[PDB]
Amino acid sequence: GTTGERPFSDIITSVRYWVIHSITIPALFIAGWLFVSTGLAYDVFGTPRPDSYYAQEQRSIPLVTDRFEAKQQVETFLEQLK
């Protein structure tokens, strides 16, 4: 019924367990938060900010239309915001 690993119930009721994870768990939560609040997640993944979906007087989707020019096409759209 057992293969040698320490039982889960034995672990999460232990004091050493909660001494470490009371730090690691919030720290991870805070790190994730900061990835968003600093705006880093936008830049890493290329996701439009609420103000950068369209240019001001634009209602056309900036749709990729070329396979091998696709990279340059997105950068063209992005500069038409900057």
Binding site: E5, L28, F29, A31, G32, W33, F35, A41, P50
Partner: protein
């Protein structure tokens, strides 16, 4: 007489560590305004 770091240990944190990080990021998102 229980090993701490095991294959099990790796499997678990492989899922747990990003799940909490993601949870924090998704939490922050709730306060974004347009």
């Amino acid at each position: 007489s229980y090993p701490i770091f095991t294959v099990r240990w790796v499997a678990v944190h492989t899922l747990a560590v990003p799940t909490i990080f993601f949870l924090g990021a998704i939490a922050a998102m709730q306060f974004i305004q347009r």
